[PDB]
């Protein structure tokens, strides 16, 4: 319709603003279908996600609304943003399709990780990660599912996070101990994940690969050592029964886990290793915080007040998580967000 034109993408019809051209599918749901596209107004490459059946049921509708509000809580260059949101329908009554537009990045971290990186690129990428994470946390959003496949980059060495919790890597490998043992978590749950990613950048191998959670825990203790009693006390009896009765591991020292041979200054190597020893800590009570990681010498070189201390436009209200509405009620809420 006038401002819109249609493109057949497989069995799906994309009806989009004429500013978006050169569409081609790069992902499919499940949750929706994604096309790479050229935005002629911004002269930039974008990703366009068409939500799959957002109004099929209350679950789909709530999820759609939640994604929209989460995106409005964030405004930071190290996090994927919502450049635009539109529907080709002209009234609430016929409102049916929701299109989300975000930045098109070049690739995820999976392959970048497997290649040799100088300390500058390593620390700068991690700095950007920590900036995005801090912004998320300030916005009342703890990711919990950070991994190479949901962190994306461009050839200019810029980095953005998406998925507030191809190639494809299962989460799990990167999930914090408190998560896999079901202990509950706080902000620094995301630091463990950063630690796993940093450790993998350093040796181009997954630190803690397990067929399942149980085997995961084993790889963790084999390398880092059995946690203290005061930690195992925080465990639910069933989990404690298993964990407390494994063979006892002293853990390998960090110089042994990440020797100099894996690094290119001998100073920078010792600093990276010190940071790793503070992130890869089983007990969240003893794990380094985001603010402290940012201030760490390995990271602080890149410090910029505007990038670290930038407050989010909104704080996510967790009350939404328990709220329920009929389909039509969710739909009106979503229509309002879209038309705004």
């Amino acid at each position: 319709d006038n401002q819109f034109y249609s493109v057949e993408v497989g069995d799906s019809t994309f009806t989009v603003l004429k500013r978006y051209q050169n569409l081609k599918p790069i992902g499919s749901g499940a949750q929706g279908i994604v096309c790479a596209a050229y935005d002629a107004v911004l002269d930039r490459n974008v990703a366009i996600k068409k939500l799959s059946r957002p109004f099929q049921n209350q679950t789909h509708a709530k999820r759609a609304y939640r994604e929209l509000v989460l995106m409005k809580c964030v405004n930071h260059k190290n996090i994927i943003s919502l450049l635009n949101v539109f529907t080709p329908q002209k009234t609430l009554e016929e409102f049916q399709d929701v299109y989300l537009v975000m930045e098109l990045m070049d690739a995820n971290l999976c392959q970048v990780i497997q290649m040799e990186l100088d300390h500058e690129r390593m620390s700068y990428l991690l700095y950007q990660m920590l900036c995005g994470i801090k912004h998320l946390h300030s916005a009342g959003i703890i990711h919990r599912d950070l991994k190479p496949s949901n962190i994306v980059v461009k050839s200019d060495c810029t980095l953005k996070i998406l998925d507030f919790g191809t190639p494809y890597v299962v989460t799990r490998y990167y999930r914090a101990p408190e998560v896999i043992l079901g202990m509950g978590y706080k902000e620094n749950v995301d630091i463990w994940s950063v630690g796993c990613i940093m450790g993998e950048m350093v040796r181009h191998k997954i630190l803690f690969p397990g067929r399942d959670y149980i085997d995961q825990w084993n790889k963790v203790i084999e390398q880092l050592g059995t946690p203290c009693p005061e930690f195992m006390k925080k465990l639910q009896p069933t989990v404690r029964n298993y964990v407390e009765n494994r063979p006892k591991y002293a853990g390998l020292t960090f110089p042994k886990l990440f020797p100099d041979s894996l690094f290119p200054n001998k100073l920078k190597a010792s600093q990276a290793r010190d940071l790793l020893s503070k992130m890869l800590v089983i007990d969240p009570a003893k794990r380094i915080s985001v603010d402290d990681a940012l201030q760490h010498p390995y990271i602080n070189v890149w410090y910029d007040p505007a990038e670290v201390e930038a407050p989010p436009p909104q704080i996510y209200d967790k009350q939404l998580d328990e709220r329920e509405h009929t389909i039509e009620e969710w739909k009106e809420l979503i229509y309002k967000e879209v038309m705004n």
Binding site: V112, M115, E120, Y124, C157
Partner: peptide
């Protein structure tokens, strides 16, 4: 130091 401006994705 100045920030990296290139990243080789291969």
């Amino acid at each position: 130091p100045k920030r990296p401006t290139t990243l080789n994705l291969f």
